[PDB]
Amino acid sequence: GAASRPAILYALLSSS
């Protein structure tokens, strides 16, 4: 779920 989503990856991809 959201628990297994890699937080650092998501943060990197979310940045503009």
Place this chain on the structure above:
Amino acid sequence: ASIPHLILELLKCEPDEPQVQAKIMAYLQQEQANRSKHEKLSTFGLMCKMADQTLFSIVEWARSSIFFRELKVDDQMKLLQNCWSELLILDHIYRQVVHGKEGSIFLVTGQQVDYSIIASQAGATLNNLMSHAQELVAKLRSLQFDQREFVCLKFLVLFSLDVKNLENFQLVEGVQEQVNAALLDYTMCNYPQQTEKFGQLLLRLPEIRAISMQAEEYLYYKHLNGDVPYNNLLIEMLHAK
């Protein structure tokens, strides 16, 4: 080299390799300097943070790349969750081809380690991983694998037809079709004497997948023994499934 224009587009986000090597080496030196004489990271922990930093550099590569940068974040996540370890393997083998020498491993930091050191100090699981990687490097050296082909392979790894539930699957089909075509054009024009180069390159892709899986398995047991440092990208990818 005559180069298909598509491959020129792909090449535009390549890093200055020796600069990145030096930046990573400087990072690891700063990590160790931040640490007291007695709290220094282990070799294994340092090697994990080196792979971590490499992965950051890979993510920066993908996020800025043509095509990939037009996907929604949740598609980007799905692609990278599928291929992260294949891309770290591919990065590694290409580095061995262009910077490395037979007999030693060339690390992303620019340091070299004799395989005989590794054979005498590492366990069977790591040794077998190193053996399989060496076989792959031998093949790619033999083929005179170059940067143009490397960037095509990265794109074919990244835009994987194995990935379910994408919002823009059509772009994956397009990358597969058009990058295969550009790669074949490239090999046929630039290595005509190797009549099967395109197909021999492509035969390495399932081998990279296999190695990547064996690597994940190795890191997974090392994690079970508490040995993989956490708070980083590497360990998160490993746990994402």
